[PDB]
């Protein structure tokens, strides 16, 4: 296995703007496929990057920028990795959402609104090459990331991903750590042949390719290089943690045993901050954290993995994820803070997650039993608040991610998933549990837990349109755990 920590962690440079003006600022990206190195004793890997880079340039904007983005197909015409066909025109299909954003329902990244090369062909949902981000939202880590019906599980894997961090200038009073102590770090485990080239499994009287039901790679690369090393200087950091990877959830901690204090989710900062031994983080979700390093000059110090993917974690591997090593020598005093108090926050549907089975043996995942060509049945009105009780009676985790708003979560409750499965009876086997400190704030992708009613709470607004509700494990969402959501406008 490759050798850990030879390699330092890469910051993504943040991408300059085509043109700005104090009320407009355009931005140009193009999709590439590129080379790059993984790991010190790699050759070049072949990948397709935003820019030509894996990951894509970090995107910083303020809250409420006006916003435009046009995102380009410059790829080739067939694809590297393995396509099935079968879970249904042109080969490589791409559309861009950015992940958290507050965004008019044209620029989300509808999975029918692909394009190809050039735009030459486009789905049926295309409509504009030049995507909108209005940015009236809180400050918060997003990132953006392909969205191609059938295809996000192979585009993603490519290196189709990238960080996008809203800034609210009224935060700036709480004097939390900034500029080069303010770092993006997008986990992604991958499976890298000795050549270098990508390994994606083309099978789980099965098609050929067939899609899997979940990929647990065997690195872990943390922005675009396998285990690397950050050298920082010991005070206090701030680390915007983007789980990126297809399916794998990440079980965080530090091997010195100091702790994270957690001052942020995918919605934004927490009310309060917590402080945190480990946390779970699964595909697509944020933690905006602090790192202390003050008290640990000179040291060592891995970022662990205690999380399975498909079994017990390997010391030597994916039980490992990044190192800190504290020699950086201060470059002045640590003027930045860790405050405790961060901000001030102010019809009911049932959904059944559950998987059947397809002509060929294989699982298929779905959202209330539905297909993603089904008639529209999630139609909440513009402007209204809904309750959605989540039912998951599968044996794993499904982390649920809901295009255009952020949700506060109520409670978990668990249930006996046998008597459920027959009568279709809801038979609690506990009391409802409220959300940890952790989930206290605003979520955009939720873990839904095996035998458990989760209960969230979300305002569907402030635009009406066509837009899409499904799990964020790729191989999942593609197959076909994703639905239409229509937020009506009278
Ligand atoms: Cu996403
Ligand atoms: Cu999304
Ligand atoms: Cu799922
Ligand atoms: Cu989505």
New binding site residues.
């Given amino acids: 296995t490759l050798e850990k920590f030879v390699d330092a962690l890469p910051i993504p440079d943040t991408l300059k703007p085509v043109q700005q003006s104090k009320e407009k600022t355009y931005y140009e990206v193009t999709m590439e496929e590129c080379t790059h190195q993984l790991h010190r004793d790699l050759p070049p890997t072949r990948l397709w990057g935003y820019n030509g880079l894996f990951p894509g340039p970090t995107i910083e904007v303020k809250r409420n920028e006006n916003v435009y983005v046009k995102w380009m197909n410059n790829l080739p015409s067939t694809h590297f990795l393995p396509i099935d066909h079968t879970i249904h025109e042109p080969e490589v299909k791409t559309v861009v959402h950015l992940h958290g954003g507050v965004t008019p329902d044209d620029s989300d990244g509808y999975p029918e609104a692909w394009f190809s090369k050039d735009f030459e062909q486009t789905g049926p949902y295309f409509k504009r090459e030049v995507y909108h981000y209005p940015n009236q939202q809180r400050g918060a880590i997003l990132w953006y990331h392909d969205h191609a019906m059938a295809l996000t599980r192979l585009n993603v894997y490519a290196g189709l991903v990238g960080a996008y961090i809203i800034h609210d200038p009224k935060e700036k009073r709480l004097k939390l750590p900034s500029d080069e102590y303010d770092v993006p770090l997008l986990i992604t485990d991958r499976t890298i042949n000795e050549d270098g080239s990508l390994f994606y499994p083309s099978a789980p009287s099965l098609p050929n390719p067939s899609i899997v039901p979940a990929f647990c790679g065997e690195t872990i690369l943390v922005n675009g290089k396998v285990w690397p090393y950050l050298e920082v200087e010991p005070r206090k950091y701030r680390f915007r943690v983007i789980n990126a990877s297809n399916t794998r959830t990440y079980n965080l901690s530090l091997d010195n045993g100091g702790d994270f204090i957690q001052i942020g989710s995918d919605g934004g900062l927490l009310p309060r901050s917590v402080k945190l031994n480990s946390f779970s983080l699964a595909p697509a979700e944020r933690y905006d954290i602090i790192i202390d390093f003050t008290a640990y000059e000179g040291e060592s110090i891995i970022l662990a993995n205690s999380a399975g993917c498909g079994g017990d974690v390997n010391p030597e591997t994916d039980a490992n994820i990044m190192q800190f090593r504290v020699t950086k020598p201060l470059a002045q005093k640590d003027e930045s803070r860790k405050p405790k108090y961060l901000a001030s926050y102010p019809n009911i549907r049932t959904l059944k997650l559950a998987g059947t089975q397809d002509e060929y043996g294989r699982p298929v ?1 779905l959202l209330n039993n539905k297909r993603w060509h089904d008639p529209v049945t999630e139609t909440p009105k513009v402007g209204t608040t809904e309750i959605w009780s989540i039912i998951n009676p599968t044996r794993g985790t ?1 982390p649920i991610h809901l295009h255009l708003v952020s949700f506060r979560v109520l409670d978990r409750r668990p249930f006996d998933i046998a008597r459920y499965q027959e009568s279709g009876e809801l038979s609690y086997t506990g009391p409802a549990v409220p959300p940890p400190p952790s989930e206290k704030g605003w979520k955009d992708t939720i873990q839904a837990h095996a035998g458990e009613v989760l209960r969230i709470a979300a305002t569907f607004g402030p635009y009406s349109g066509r837009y899409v509700w499904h ?1 964020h ?1 790729l191989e ?1 969402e593609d197959y076909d ?1 994703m639905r239409p959501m229509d937020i009506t406008d009278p």
């Fill in positions: 995942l499904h799990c494990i999942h755990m």
